[PDB]
């Protein structure tokens, strides 16, 4: 009474993507397939001659949707469902994050701002590390202060894509004002694909 679906799948454009939905005794059942582009509601997929990119195929044990000639507009999550006549549950799949790796790498530009002067009048401090125009998505961010890493209060965003179709994220480091004026300098050690960019600020 369960359906297995792989978590991630990466396919180059124009190639062939093969998503699997593993069940049991699913030969008689016809598994519907869905496509949920991020944000929007999932749209039910519907299948020389008339060329067909999507082909819904089932084979008794594991039914696999095959995407042919992968386009950039196919990058989305794909789900499978079926009616369990035995238990009367419509069982959804885990969803497969189809990632189209056609875009090339791009080093992340990092912008860092110190605590605002008006912040400190409220007896609170908040630094801000801004990583923009990164790619693909790895942005391990580490906070070092006065030549020592600071992990207390560091809060970082989960990466989310942007209008330019490059992924950008942000990281905040709440601090006490007396501590912020004590140290000599701070740094946002952001690591990306093995390469690390670092910006430094100081209490002026």
């Amino acid at each position: 009474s369960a359906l297995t679906q792989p978590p991630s799948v990466s396919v180059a454009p124009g190639q062939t993507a093969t998503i699997t939905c593993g069940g049991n005794n699913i030969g008689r059942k016809r598994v519907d397939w869905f496509q949920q582009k991020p944000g929007q509601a999932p749209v039910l997929v519907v299948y020389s001659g008339i060329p067909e990119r999507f082909s819904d195929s089932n084979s008794g044990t594991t039914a696999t949707l095959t995407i042919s000639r992968v386009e950039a507009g196919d990058e989305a999550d794909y789900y499978c469902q079926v009616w369990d006549s035995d238990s009367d549950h419509v069982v959804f799949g885990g969803g497969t994050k189809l990632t189209v790796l056609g875009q090339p790498k791009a080093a992340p530009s990092v912008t860092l701002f110190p605590p605002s002067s008006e912040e400190l009048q409220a007896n609170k401090a908040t630094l801000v590390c801004l990583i923009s125009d990164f790619y693909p998505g790895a942005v391990t961010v580490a906070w070092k202060a006065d030549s020592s890493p600071v992990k207390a209060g560091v809060e970082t965003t989960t990466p989310s894509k942007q209008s330019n179709n490059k992924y950008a994220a942000s990281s905040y480091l709440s601090l006490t004002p007396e501590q912020w004026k004590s140290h000599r300098s701070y740094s946002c050690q952001v690591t990306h694909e093995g390469s690390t960019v670092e910006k430094t600020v100081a209490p002026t």
């Binding site: 016809r30 959804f92 799949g93 969803g95 008006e118 809060e155 994220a169 942000s170 905040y172 709440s174």
Partner: protein, 216 residues
């Protein structure tokens, strides 16, 4: 045929939410209507269906007892309220219609073909708060809207005059339950002192809009 759900919902634990699904373009009593629920950044999960003609209810295993699915027929709409919500019920709820007709006589279950917009319901124990906007001095400028709820704050620069380098970021929800976001706009270094930039953070739910200025 298109389905229209209710507006976005933001309620504290203990308050009830009601998501209405309106159906237009077919004989309302024709086919079933299911209610798939999507958690924040997770997979779809079934909640159950309701036949608008007979009015019967078939609930999922973990959604029984606290989820009541009604029907109206007169207004041709379907509901799915959850009395006494909880902090783990924050999710985007979807209604769907079983419009797909079976391709075989062996498995006569109509598949979901028409899907609603998706009413993003947010349930959390935090109280409403207004964003305190601070200026981020410098090339790149910046702004900081700190500790606010509920989403969204709409940030633009110079009352819409500037769109070149603005990159208002995504909010980073803190442990306290209050969101926080920043907006940066790269302006030429020669212009500082010859141009005034103003954050236009506007937060409708807290009725707080402030046009704070970024200055060196």
């Amino acid at each position: 045929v298109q389905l229209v759900q209710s507006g976005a919902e933001v309620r504290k634990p203990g308050a009830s939410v009601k998501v209405s699904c309106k159906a237009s373009g077919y004989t309302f009593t024709d086919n079933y209507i299911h209610w798939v629920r999507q958690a924040p950044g997770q997979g779809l999960e079934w909640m159950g269906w309701i036949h608008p003609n007979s009015g019967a209810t078939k609930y999922a295993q973990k959604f029984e007892g606290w989820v009541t699915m009604t029907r109206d027929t007169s207004i041709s709409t379907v509901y799915m309220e959850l009395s006494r919500s909880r902090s783990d019920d924050t999710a985007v709820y979807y209604c769907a219609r079983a419009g797909l007709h079976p391709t075989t006589t062996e498995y006569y279950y109509y598949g979901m073909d028409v899907w609603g917009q998706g009413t993003a319901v947010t349930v959390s124990s935090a109280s409403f708060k207004g964003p305190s906007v601070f200026p981020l001095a410098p090339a790149a400028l910046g702004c900081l809207v700190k500790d606010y709820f509920p989403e969204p704050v709409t940030v633009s620069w110079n009352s819409g005059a500037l769109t070149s380098g603005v990159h208002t970021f995504p909010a980073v929800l803190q442990s306290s339950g209050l969101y926080s976001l920043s907006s940066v706009v790269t302006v030429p270094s020669s212009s500082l002192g010859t141009q005034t930039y103003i954050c236009n953070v506007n937060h409708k739910p807290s009725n707080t809009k402030v046009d704070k200025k970024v200055e060196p």
